[PDB]
JSON list of C-alpha atoms and ligand atoms in Angstrom, two decimals:
[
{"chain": "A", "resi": 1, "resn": "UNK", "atom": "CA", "xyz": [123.82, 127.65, 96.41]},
{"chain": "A", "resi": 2, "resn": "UNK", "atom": "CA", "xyz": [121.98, 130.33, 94.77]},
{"chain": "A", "resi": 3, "resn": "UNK", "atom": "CA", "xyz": [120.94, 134.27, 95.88]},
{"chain": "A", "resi": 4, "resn": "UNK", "atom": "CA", "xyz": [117.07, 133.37, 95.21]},
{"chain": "A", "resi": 5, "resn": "UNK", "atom": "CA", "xyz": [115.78, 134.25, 99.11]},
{"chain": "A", "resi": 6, "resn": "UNK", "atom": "CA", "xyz": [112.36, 133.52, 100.93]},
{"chain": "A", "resi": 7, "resn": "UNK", "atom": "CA", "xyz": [110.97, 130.81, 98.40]},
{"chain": "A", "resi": 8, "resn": "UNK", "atom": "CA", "xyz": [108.83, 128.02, 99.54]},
{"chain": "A", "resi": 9, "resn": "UNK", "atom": "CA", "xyz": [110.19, 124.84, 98.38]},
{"chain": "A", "resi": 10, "resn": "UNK", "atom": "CA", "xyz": [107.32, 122.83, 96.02]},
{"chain": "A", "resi": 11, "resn": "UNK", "atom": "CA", "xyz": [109.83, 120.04, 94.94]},
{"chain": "A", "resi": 12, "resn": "UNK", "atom": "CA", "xyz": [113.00, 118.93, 94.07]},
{"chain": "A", "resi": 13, "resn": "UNK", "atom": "CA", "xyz": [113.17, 121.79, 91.80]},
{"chain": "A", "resi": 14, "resn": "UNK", "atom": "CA", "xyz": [110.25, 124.32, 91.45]},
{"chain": "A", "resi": 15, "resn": "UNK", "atom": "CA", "xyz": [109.89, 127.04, 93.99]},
{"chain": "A", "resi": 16, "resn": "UNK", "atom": "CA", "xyz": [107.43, 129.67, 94.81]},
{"chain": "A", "resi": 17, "resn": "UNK", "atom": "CA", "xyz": [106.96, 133.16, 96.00]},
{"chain": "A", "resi": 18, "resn": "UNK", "atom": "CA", "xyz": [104.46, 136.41, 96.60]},
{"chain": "A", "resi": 19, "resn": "UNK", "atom": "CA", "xyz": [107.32, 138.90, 94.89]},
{"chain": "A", "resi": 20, "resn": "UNK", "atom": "CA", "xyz": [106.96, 141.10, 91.66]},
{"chain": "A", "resi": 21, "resn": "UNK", "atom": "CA", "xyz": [108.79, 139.42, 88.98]},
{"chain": "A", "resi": 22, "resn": "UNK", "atom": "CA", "xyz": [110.13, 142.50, 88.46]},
{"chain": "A", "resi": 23, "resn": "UNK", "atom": "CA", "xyz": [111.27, 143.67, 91.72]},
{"chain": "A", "resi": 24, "resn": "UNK", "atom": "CA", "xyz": [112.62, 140.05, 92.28]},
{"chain": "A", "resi": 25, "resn": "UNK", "atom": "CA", "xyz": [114.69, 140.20, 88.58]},
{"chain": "A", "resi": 26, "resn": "UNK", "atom": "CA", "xyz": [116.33, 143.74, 89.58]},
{"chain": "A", "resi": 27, "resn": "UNK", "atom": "CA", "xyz": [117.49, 142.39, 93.23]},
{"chain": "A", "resi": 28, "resn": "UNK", "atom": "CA", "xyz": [118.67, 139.03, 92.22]},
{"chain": "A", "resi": 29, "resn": "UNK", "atom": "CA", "xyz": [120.05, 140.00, 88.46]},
{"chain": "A", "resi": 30, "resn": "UNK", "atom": "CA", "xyz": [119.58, 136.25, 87.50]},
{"chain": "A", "resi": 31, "resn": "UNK", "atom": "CA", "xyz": [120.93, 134.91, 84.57]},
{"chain": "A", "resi": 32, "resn": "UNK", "atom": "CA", "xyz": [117.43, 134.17, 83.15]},
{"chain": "A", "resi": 33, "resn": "UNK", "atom": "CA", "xyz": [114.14, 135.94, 83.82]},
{"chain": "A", "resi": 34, "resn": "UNK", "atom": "CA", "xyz": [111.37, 134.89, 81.82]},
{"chain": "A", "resi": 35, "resn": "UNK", "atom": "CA", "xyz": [108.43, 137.05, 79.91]},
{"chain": "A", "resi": 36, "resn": "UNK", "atom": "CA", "xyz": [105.34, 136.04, 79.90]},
{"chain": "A", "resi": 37, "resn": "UNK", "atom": "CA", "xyz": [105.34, 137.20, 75.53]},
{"chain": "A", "resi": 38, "resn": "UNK", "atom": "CA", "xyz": [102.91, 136.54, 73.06]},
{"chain": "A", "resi": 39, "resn": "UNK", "atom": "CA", "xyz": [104.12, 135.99, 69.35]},
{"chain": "A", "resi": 40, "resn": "UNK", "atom": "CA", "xyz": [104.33, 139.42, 67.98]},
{"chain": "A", "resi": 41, "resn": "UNK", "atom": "CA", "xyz": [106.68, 140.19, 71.53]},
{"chain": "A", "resi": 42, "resn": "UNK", "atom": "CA", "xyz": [104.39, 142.78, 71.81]},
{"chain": "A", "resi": 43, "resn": "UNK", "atom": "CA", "xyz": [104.98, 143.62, 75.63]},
{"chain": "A", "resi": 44, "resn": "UNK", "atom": "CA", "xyz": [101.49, 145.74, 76.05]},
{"chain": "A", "resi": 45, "resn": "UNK", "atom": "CA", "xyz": [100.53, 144.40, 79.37]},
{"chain": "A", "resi": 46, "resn": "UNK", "atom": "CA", "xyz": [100.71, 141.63, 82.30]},
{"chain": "A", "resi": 47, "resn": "UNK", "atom": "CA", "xyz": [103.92, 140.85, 82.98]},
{"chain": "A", "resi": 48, "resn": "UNK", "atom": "CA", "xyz": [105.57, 141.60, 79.75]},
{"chain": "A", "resi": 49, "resn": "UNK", "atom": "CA", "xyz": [104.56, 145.25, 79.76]},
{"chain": "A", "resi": 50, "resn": "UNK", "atom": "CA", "xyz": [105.80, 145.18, 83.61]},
{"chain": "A", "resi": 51, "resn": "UNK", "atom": "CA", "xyz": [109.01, 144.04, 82.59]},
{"chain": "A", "resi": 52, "resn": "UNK", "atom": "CA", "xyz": [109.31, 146.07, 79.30]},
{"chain": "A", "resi": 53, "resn": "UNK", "atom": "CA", "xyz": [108.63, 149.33, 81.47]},
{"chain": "A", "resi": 54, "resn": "UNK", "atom": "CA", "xyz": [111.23, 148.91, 83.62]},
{"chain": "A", "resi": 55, "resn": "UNK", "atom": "CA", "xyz": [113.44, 148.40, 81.03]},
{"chain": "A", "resi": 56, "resn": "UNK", "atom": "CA", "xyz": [112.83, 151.99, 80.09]},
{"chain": "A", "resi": 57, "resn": "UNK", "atom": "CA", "xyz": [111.07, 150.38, 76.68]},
{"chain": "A", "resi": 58, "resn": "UNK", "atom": "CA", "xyz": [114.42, 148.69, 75.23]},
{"chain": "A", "resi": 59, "resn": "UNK", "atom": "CA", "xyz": [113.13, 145.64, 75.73]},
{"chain": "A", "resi": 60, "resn": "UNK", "atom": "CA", "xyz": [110.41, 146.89, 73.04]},
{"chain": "A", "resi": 61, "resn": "UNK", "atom": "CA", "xyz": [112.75, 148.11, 70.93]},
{"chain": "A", "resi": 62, "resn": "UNK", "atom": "CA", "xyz": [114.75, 144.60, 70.93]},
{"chain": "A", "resi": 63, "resn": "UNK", "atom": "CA", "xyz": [112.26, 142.81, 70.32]},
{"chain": "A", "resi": 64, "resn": "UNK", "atom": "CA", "xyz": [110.92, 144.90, 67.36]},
{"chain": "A", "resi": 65, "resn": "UNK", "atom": "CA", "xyz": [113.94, 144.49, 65.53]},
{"chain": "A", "resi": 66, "resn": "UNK", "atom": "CA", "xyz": [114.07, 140.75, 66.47]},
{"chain": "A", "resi": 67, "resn": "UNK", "atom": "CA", "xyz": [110.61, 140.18, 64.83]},
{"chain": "A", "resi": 68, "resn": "UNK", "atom": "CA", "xyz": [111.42, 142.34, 61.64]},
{"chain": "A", "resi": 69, "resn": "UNK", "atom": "CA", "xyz": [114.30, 139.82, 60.98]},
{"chain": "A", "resi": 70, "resn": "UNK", "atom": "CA", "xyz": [112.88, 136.92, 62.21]},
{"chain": "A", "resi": 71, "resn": "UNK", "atom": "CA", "xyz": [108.91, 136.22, 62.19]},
{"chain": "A", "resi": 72, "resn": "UNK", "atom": "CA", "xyz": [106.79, 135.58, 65.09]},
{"chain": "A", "resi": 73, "resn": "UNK", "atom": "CA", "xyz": [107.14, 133.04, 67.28]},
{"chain": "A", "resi": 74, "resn": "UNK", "atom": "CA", "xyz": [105.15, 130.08, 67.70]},
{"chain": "A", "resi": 75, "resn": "UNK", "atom": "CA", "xyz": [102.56, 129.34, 70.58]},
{"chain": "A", "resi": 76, "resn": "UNK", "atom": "CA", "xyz": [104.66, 127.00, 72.82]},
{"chain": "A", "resi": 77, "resn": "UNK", "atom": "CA", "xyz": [108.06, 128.68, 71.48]},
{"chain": "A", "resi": 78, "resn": "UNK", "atom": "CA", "xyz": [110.36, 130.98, 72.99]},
{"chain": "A", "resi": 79, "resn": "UNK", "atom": "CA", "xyz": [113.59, 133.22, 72.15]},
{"chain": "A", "resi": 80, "resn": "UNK", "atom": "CA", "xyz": [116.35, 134.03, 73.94]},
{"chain": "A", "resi": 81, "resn": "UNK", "atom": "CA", "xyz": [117.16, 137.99, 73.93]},
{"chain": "A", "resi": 82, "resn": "UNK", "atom": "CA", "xyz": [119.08, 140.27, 76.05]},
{"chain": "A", "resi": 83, "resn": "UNK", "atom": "CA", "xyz": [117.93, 140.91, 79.84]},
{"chain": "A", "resi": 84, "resn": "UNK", "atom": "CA", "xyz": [118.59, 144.44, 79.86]},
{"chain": "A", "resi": 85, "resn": "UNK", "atom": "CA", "xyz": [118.92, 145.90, 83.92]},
{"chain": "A", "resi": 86, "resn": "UNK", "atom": "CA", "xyz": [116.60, 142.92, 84.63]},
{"chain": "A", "resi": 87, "resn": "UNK", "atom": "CA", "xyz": [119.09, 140.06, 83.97]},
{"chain": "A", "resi": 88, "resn": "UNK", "atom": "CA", "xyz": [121.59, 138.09, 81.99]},
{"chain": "A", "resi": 89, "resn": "UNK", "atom": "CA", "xyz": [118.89, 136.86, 79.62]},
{"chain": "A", "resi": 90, "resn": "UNK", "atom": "CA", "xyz": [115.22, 136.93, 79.35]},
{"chain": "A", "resi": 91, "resn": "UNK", "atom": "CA", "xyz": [113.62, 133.96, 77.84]},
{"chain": "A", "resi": 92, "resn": "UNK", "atom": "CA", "xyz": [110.62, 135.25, 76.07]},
{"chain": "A", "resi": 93, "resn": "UNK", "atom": "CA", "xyz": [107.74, 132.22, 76.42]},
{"chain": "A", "resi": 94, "resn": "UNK", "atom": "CA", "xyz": [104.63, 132.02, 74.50]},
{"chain": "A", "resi": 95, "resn": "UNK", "atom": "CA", "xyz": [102.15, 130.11, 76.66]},
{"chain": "A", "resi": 96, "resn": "UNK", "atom": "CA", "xyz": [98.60, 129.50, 74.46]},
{"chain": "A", "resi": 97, "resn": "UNK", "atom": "CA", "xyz": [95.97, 132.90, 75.26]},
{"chain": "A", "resi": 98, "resn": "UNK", "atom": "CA", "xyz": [92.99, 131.64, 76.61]},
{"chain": "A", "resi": 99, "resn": "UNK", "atom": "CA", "xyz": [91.75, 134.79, 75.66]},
{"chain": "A", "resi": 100, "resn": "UNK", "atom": "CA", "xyz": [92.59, 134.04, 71.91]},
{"chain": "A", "resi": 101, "resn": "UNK", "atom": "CA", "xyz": [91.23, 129.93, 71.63]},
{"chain": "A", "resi": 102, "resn": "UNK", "atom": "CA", "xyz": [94.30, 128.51, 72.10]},
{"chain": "A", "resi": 103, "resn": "UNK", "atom": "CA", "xyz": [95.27, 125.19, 72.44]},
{"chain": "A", "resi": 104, "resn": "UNK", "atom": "CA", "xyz": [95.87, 124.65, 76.53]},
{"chain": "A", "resi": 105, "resn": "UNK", "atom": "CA", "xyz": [97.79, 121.44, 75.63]},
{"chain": "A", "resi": 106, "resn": "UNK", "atom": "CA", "xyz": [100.41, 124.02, 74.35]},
{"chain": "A", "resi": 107, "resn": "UNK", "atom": "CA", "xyz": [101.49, 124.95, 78.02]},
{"chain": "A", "resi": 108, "resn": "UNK", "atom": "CA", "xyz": [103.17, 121.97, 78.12]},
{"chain": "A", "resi": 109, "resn": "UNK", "atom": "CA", "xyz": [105.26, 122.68, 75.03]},
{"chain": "A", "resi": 110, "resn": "UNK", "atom": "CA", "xyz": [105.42, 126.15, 76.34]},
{"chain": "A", "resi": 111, "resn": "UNK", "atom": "CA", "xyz": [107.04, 124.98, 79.48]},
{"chain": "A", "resi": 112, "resn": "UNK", "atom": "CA", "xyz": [109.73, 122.79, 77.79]},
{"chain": "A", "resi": 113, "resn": "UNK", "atom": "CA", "xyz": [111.77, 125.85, 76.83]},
{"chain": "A", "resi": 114, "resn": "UNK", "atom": "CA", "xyz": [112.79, 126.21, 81.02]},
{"chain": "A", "resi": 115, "resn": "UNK", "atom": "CA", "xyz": [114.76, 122.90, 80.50]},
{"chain": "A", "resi": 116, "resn": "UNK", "atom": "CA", "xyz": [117.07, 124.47, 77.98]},
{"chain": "A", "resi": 117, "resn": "UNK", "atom": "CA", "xyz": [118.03, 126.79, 80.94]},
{"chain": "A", "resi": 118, "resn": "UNK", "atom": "CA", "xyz": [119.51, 125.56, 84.36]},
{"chain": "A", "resi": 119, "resn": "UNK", "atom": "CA", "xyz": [118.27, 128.07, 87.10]},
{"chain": "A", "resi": 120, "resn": "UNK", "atom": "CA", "xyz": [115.15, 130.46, 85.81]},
{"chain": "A", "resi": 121, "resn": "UNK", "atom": "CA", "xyz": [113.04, 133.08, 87.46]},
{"chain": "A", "resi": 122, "resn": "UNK", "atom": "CA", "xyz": [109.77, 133.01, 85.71]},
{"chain": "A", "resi": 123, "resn": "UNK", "atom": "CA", "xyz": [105.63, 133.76, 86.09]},
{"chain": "A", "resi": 124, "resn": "UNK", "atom": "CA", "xyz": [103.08, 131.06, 85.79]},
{"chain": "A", "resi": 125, "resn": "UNK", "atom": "CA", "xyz": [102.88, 130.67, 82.39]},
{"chain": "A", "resi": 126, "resn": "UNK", "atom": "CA", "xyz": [99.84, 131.34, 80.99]},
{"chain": "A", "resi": 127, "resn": "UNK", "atom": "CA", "xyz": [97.99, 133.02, 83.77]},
{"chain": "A", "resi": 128, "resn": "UNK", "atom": "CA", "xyz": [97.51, 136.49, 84.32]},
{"chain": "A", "resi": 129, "resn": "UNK", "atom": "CA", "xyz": [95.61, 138.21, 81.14]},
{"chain": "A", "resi": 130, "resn": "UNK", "atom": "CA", "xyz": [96.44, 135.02, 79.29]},
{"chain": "A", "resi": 131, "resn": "UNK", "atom": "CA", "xyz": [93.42, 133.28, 80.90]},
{"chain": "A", "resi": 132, "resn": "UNK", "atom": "CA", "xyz": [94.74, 130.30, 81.86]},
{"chain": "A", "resi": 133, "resn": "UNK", "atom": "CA", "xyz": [94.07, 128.30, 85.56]},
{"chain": "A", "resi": 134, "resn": "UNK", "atom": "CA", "xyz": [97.11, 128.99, 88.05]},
{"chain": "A", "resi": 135, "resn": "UNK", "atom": "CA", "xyz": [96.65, 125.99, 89.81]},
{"chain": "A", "resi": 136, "resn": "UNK", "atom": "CA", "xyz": [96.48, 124.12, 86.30]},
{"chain": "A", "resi": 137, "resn": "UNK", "atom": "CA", "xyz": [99.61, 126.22, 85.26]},
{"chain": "A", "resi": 138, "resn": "UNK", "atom": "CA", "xyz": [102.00, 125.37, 88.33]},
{"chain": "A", "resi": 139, "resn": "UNK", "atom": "CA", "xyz": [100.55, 121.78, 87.98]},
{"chain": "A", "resi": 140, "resn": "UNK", "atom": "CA", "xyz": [102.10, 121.74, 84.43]},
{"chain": "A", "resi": 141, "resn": "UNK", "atom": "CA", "xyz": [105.44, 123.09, 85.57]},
{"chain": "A", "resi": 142, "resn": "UNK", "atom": "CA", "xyz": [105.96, 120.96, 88.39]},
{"chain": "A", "resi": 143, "resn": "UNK", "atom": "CA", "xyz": [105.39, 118.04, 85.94]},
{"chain": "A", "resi": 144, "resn": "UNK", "atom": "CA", "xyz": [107.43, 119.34, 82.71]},
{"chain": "A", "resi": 145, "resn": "UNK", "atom": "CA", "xyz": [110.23, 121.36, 84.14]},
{"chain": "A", "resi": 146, "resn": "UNK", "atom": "CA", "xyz": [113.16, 119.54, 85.46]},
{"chain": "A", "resi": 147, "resn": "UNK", "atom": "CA", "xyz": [115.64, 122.64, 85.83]},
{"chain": "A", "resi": 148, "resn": "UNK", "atom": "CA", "xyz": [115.68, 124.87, 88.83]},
{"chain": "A", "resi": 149, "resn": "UNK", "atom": "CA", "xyz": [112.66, 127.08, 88.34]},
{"chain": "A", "resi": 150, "resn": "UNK", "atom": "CA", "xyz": [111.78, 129.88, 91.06]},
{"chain": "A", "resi": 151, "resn": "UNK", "atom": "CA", "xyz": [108.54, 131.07, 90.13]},
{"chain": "A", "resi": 152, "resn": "UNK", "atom": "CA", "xyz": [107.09, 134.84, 91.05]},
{"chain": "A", "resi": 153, "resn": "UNK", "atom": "CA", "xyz": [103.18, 135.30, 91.83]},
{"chain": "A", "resi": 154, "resn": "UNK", "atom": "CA", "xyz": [102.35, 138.72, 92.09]},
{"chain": "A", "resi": 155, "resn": "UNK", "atom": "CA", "xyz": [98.85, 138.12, 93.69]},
{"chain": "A", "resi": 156, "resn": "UNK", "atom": "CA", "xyz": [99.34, 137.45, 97.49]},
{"chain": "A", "resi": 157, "resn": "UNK", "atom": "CA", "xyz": [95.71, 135.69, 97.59]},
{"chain": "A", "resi": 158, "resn": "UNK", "atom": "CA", "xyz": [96.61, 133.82, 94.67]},
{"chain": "A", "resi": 159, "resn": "UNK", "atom": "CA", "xyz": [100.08, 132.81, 95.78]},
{"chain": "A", "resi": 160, "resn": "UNK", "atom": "CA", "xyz": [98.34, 131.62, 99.50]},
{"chain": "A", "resi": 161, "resn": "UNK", "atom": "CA", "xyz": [95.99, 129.33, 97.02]},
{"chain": "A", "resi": 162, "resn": "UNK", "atom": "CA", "xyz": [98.56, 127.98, 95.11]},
{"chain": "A", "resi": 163, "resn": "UNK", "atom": "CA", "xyz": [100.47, 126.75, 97.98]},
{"chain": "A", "resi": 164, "resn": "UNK", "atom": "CA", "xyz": [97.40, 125.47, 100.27]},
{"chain": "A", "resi": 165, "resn": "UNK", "atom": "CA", "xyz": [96.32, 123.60, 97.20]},
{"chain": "A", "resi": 166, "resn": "UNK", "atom": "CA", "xyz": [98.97, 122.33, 95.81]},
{"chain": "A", "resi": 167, "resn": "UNK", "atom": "CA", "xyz": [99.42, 118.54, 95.79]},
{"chain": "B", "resi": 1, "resn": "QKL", "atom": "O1", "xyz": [103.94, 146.16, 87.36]},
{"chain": "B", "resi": 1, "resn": "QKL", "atom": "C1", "xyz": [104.79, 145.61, 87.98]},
{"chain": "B", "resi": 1, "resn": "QKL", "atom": "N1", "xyz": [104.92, 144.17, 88.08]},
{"chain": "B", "resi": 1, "resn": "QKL", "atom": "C2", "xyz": [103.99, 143.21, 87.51]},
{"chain": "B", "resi": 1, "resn": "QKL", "atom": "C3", "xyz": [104.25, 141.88, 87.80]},
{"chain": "B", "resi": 1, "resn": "QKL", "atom": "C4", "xyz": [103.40, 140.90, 87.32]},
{"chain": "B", "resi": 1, "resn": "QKL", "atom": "C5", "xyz": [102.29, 141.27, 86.56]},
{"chain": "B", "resi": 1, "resn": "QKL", "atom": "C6", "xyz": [101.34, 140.17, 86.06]},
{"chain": "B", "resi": 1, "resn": "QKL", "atom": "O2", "xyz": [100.37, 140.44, 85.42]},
{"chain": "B", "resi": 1, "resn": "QKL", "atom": "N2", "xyz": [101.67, 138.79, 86.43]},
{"chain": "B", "resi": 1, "resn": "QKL", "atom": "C7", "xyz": [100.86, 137.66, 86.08]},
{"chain": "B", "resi": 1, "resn": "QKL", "atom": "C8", "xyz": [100.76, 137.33, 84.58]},
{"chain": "B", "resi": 1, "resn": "QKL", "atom": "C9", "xyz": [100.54, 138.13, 83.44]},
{"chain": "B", "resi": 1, "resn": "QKL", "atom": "C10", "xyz": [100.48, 137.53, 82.19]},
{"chain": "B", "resi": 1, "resn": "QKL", "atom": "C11", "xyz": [100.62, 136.15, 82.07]},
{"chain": "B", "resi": 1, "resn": "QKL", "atom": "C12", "xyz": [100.83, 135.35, 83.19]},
{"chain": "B", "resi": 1, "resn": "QKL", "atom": "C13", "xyz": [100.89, 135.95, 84.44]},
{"chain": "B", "resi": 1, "resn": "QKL", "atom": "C14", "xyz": [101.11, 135.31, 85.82]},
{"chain": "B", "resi": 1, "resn": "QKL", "atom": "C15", "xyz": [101.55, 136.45, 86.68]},
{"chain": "B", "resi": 1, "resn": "QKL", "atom": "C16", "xyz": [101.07, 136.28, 88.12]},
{"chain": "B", "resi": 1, "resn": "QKL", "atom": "O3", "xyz": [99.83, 136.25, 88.37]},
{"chain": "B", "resi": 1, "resn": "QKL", "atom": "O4", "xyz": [101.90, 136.17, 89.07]},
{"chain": "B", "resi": 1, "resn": "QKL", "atom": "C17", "xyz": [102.02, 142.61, 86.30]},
{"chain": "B", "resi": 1, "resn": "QKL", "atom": "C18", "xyz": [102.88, 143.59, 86.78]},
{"chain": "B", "resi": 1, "resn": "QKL", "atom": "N3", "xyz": [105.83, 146.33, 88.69]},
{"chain": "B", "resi": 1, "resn": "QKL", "atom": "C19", "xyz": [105.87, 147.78, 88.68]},
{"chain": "B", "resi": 1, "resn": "QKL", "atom": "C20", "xyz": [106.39, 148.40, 89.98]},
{"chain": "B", "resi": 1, "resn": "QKL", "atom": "C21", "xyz": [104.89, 148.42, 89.67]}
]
């Protein structure tokens, strides 16, 4: 038994709700919330800036100093860092940019790093400003993630389209 409240149950393990990540990581405190980051963990926008700005820009900060040491990521990586007010952890998850050219077959990959984690709240990877298909997106986490993932959609029209469509 977990705290996670008013999901629909996809599968086994993948669950869905309308909430904002961000309102859902500050009720729940989970022990991993999940950015939606790009390489440079430059949280500008989407739900990285959402979840930087609520953590009154440390999460910024962090994340400068993790880069300066460290590199960028990859597309398809991920780091663990702290979760600030938000949670335990956050699991910082480059899905491929539409936007940028990237490789779609890298969502996959991308979603591999949830395994590594039992229990997650997360976004869609890849949606959002990253360009990607939603549908396409849960599609790819129902079928790579095997841990218990409870995934936030911000867009109530989009979260009543995932659901009616998904198979
Ligand atoms: O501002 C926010 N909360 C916030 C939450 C989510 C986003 C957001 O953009 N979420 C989508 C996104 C973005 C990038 C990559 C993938 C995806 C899939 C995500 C989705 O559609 O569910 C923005 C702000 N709270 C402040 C009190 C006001």
């Amino acid at each position: 038994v977990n705290s996670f409240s008013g999901y629909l149950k996809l599968t086994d393990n993948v669950y869905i709700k309308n909430a904002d990540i961000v309102e859902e990581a500050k009720k729940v405190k989970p022990t991993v919330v999940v950015n939606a980051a790009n390489v440079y963990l430059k949280h500008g926008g989407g739900v990285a800036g959402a979840l930087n700005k609520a953590t009154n820009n440390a999460m910024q900060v962090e994340s400068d100093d993790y880069i300066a040491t460290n590199g960028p990521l990859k597309v398809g990586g991920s780091c663990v860092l702290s979760g600030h007010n938000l949670a335990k952890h956050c699991l910082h998850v480059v899905g491929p940019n539409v936007n940028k050219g990237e490789d779609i077959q890298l969502l996959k990959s991308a979603y591999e790093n949830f395994n590594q984690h039992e229990v997650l709240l997360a976004p869609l990877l890849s949606a959002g400003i990253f360009g990607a298909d939603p549908i396409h997106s849960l599609r790819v986490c129902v079928d790579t993630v095997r841990t218990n993932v409870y995934l936030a959609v911000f867009d109530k029209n989009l979260y009543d389209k995932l659901v009616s469509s998904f198979l």
